[PDB]
Structure 1
Amino acid sequence: SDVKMSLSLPDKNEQVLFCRLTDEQHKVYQNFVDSKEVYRILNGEMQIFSGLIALRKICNHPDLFSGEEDQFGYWKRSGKMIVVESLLKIWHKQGQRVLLFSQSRQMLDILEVFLRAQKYTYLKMDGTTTIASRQPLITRYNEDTSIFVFLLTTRVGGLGVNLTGANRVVIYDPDWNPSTDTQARERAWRIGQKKQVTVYRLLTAGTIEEKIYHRQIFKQFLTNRVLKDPKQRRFFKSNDLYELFTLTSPDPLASSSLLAKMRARNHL
């Protein structure tokens, strides 16, 4: 922010998208939140890991119950995938290069399958890909514009890799650690980015994703309370309790300066 003018970067945009659950996806979410397992967890009986993981999987896609054009991970069954198809269409028609992120490897595989269903030229990288081949792949994608979309797991997709070659970035799935999201979305807007970039972070409105978004908002508030300034406004969008299982879909000093500073410290 204080170096951009002295560095001549292009413009950036931070649009956040609030998706709508599909009928099947909404039904699955409603079924699961009405299950007995979540009731047991809310009673403290069982570990909270399982319910959270299941909800994340559902919101990413109804892959719990693998439902032609009905193969496992069919794009129209998850609203986020429909919106992603729309955006990929628009950007491919706009001749832009897109960056596609995801937290989970399996949803990355479903996304790859959908991309193969389309004609888009993709190029994927996760922990599975051999390390020796990774930097070559980065060089390739930053080299040729033929590859339209780049698939990544955020745990390797972020973390110091330079992907100025891409133009557009979409964050499919949120996470508990906002730093992951920031690193991913900063994979594009770096030194050498010669085109305007815009960020699209996908959240299923009124679901677990919105609650995780609130939590990580509170986290940026905590961090900015010390790194940027101490006058940080109090987080108020949520009280951050354990009711995120619910479905709420929308619709030299001279001995005077020292004394004065110290009094000021004492009068807070």
Structure 2
Amino acid sequence: DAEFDEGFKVPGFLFKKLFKYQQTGVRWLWELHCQQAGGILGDEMGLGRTIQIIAFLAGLSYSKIRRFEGLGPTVIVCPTTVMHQWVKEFHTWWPPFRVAILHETGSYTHKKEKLIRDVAHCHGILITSYSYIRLMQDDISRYDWHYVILDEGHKIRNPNAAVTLACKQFRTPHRIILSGSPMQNNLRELWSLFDFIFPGKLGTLPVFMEQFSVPITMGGYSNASPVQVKTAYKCACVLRDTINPYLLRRMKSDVKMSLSLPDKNEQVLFCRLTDEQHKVYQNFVDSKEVYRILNGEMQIFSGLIALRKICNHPDLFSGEEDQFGYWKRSGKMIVVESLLKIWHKQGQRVLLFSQSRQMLDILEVFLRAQKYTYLKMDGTTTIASRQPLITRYNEDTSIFVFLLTTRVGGLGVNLTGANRVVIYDPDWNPSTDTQARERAWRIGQKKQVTVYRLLTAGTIEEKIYHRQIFKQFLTNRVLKDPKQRRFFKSNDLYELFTLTSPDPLASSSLLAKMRARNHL
């Protein structure tokens, strides 16, 4: 067995299956349990965040630590796609636990509240989804849960969403978030995550914004004065120090030599808008609607939707062999044709993502038009058919391409079968495409994988790219290291409607540290 401080013994066979970093994780989680604090497992996806939770809870139950005689009833909130995945995981890596699913699919086939009571009495592990948490805050928050793990916990990133409040109604201190990216757009998201795990650490939300978000953000802008750069640097370091104990973020560089992943690539392709595509885009930017949006008369979102659609396909207006969703009508589809052609000739499995769902349909009809055997998976595909679809695609190489909407396509699914990944459509959220591309390059990917980001030069999509770069740098400034380089490329204004196509410390260590921080 493996032994830690007070009484934590995790079975040796279980421990040996783990890696060194996963073992560190288990120790970290138990140290938190000792503190009675929560934490964020911010390991980069594919490292296997879930395995660490299995090990830790197993060890805790096995050690029979002393209200509760070991591990009490616990609730797992995870995105709807991965519930049965978690059930499978508990079942293999530790059969003894009862892992009840709370879902329409489920396995209970009675009233749900009976199941809640059953687990809270027999001390099982109730898996559920964020929806059923939002909808039964009353029922669920009446049973003294022992652990409240949220998988892909970033969904609580909005402090005012209903689901966030519901999740923050749970009472136990042993709150855990498993989130490959616990910060996606701005620090308001970070504060929200910390306020679930550790309700006071970062202060109130107003105070956090005032003290951290404003300064840290202002240090990223190109035009920021150096003074403000240094305030940002200070605040970023303070933030890292504040969040260090409670966030365990192992990127895939401190473990790569100790884990042996294959090569990864991140090529970008600046697609060129075709003639019809160019015409529709050039007209719509010149349209009165865009002009009115620039004047602020109505919502900007409408314009952004329209522009993104245009860059994505001329589905504003539809134009034999020129039916809706025709490939040659849009340049990015031409590029996709060439890439899938060469790759199908390479006998290689592709993973094509799209932020949209109806565009996923146009891609689907395209892949009919070709001889490419695919399998499509979006929010409309049934949840019960979800995990078997993933397993099917991973088990056999007959299925060539795998259309995916990024919202269900990301978020914890393992897709090692695919080799090539192409991100067809940008998002305003860097995390979306990041998790999308990271579906392949995980543990068990025994083959090289490259990531292609298809983008329309000079159009809205490049400006969205700039947004998500600026976001990524902001996340880097506070997660990986505060010495980020300032995003000098753009001023990031509302001129994104244009077409510009190519062509004991002994009190001296303390005071020294203080003087360092306050010298900036």
TM surpasses 0.5:
yes
> How far does the alpha carbon of each residue in 1:97-153 deviate from its partner, in whole angstroms, 9 at most, with x for none?
000100111110000001000011010110111100010000000001001100111
**Per-residue deviation at 1:259?**
1.2
- Residue 193 of structure 1 deviates from its aligned partner by 0.3
Deviation at 1:42, TM superposition (A): 0.7
2-structure distance, mates of 1:50, 1:134: 32
Is the counterpart of residue 107 in structure 1 residue 359 in structure 2? yes
Q: 1:190: Cα distance to partner?
A: 0.2
CA distance in 2, matches of 1:256, 1:33: 61
Output the TM-score relative to the length of structure 2: 0.51
SS class of match (2:393): helix
> After the TM superposition, which residues 83-162 of structure 1 pair with which residues of structure 2 at under 5 Å, given as runs?
83-162=335-414
Instruction: Please report how far the alpha carbon of residue 69 of structure 1 lies from its aligned counterpart in structure 2 after TM superposition.
Output: 1.0
Structure 2: where are the runs of 5+ without partners?
A: 1-252
Give the distance between the partners of 2:262 and 2:512, measured in 1 at CA.
Answer: 45
May I ask how many residue pairs the two structures share in their alignment?
Answer: 268
Structure with larger RCO (C-alpha < 8 A, sep 6+): 1
Secondary structure at 1:200 match in 2? strand
Q: Quick check: which has more Rg, 1 or 2?
A: 2
Secondary structure of 2:385's aligned partner = helix
Give runs of aligned pairs for residues 205-220 of structure 1, distance below 5 A: 205-220=457-472
1:64-93 deviations in Å (ceiling 9; x for gaps):
101111000100000000000000000000
Q: Distance in 1 between matches of 2:383 and 2:506?
A: 60
1:227 offset after TM fit, Å? 0.4
Secondary structure of the structure 1 residue equivalent to 2:352: strand
Q: Deviations over 1:180-228 (max 9, x none)?
A: 0100000000000000000001101110000000011000111101101
Give distance in 1, aligned partners of 2:495 and 2:438. 32
Return the alpha-carbon distance in structure 1 between the equivalents of residues 480 and 381 of structure 2.
Answer: 38
Q: Deviations over 1:2-43 (max 9, x none)?
A: 111110110000001100000000000000000000111111
Distance 2:464 2:458 in 1: 11
Q: Look up the match of 1:244.
A: 496
Larger displacement relative to structure 2 (189-198 or 253-262)? 253-262
Partner Cα distance (1:252, 1:78) in 2: 66
Shift in Å, 1:252? 1.0
Residues of 2 paired with 1:104 and 1:42: CA distance? 25
Q: Structure 1 runs of 4+ off > 3 angstroms? A: none
In 1, Cα distance between equivalents of 2:422 and 2:347: 16
Match of 2:276 in 1: 24
Counterparts of 1:157 and 1:254, CA distance in 2: 52
- Looking at structure 2, the residues matched to 93 and 218 of structure 1 have their Cα atoms a distance apart, in angstroms, of 37
Q: Give the superposition deviation at 1:254.
A: 1.5
Q: Distance in 2 between matches of 1:15 and 1:163?
A: 20
Q: SS at 1:246's partner residue?
A: coil
Determine the structure 2 residue equivalent to 1:51. 303
Taking the aligned partners of 2:515 and 2:302, their CA distance within structure 1 comes to 52
Q: Distance in 2 between matches of 1:161 and 1:89?
A: 26
Name the SS for the 1:184 alignment partner: helix
Structure 2 SS opposite 1:150: coil
Secondary structure of the residue aligned to 1:149 is coil
Root mean square deviation, CA, Å: 0.6
- Equivalent position of 2:425 in the other structure: 173
TM-score (norm 1): 0.99
Partners of 2:305 and 2:292 in 1: how far apart? Answer: 15
Match of 2:374, SS state, is: coil
Per the TM alignment, residue 253 of structure 1 is displaced from its structure 2 partner at its CA by 1.4
Fraction of identical pairs, as percent? 100
CA distance in 1, matches of 2:400, 2:360: 16
Aligned equivalents of 1:40, 1:10: Cα separation in 2: 50
Unaligned runs of 5+ in 1: none
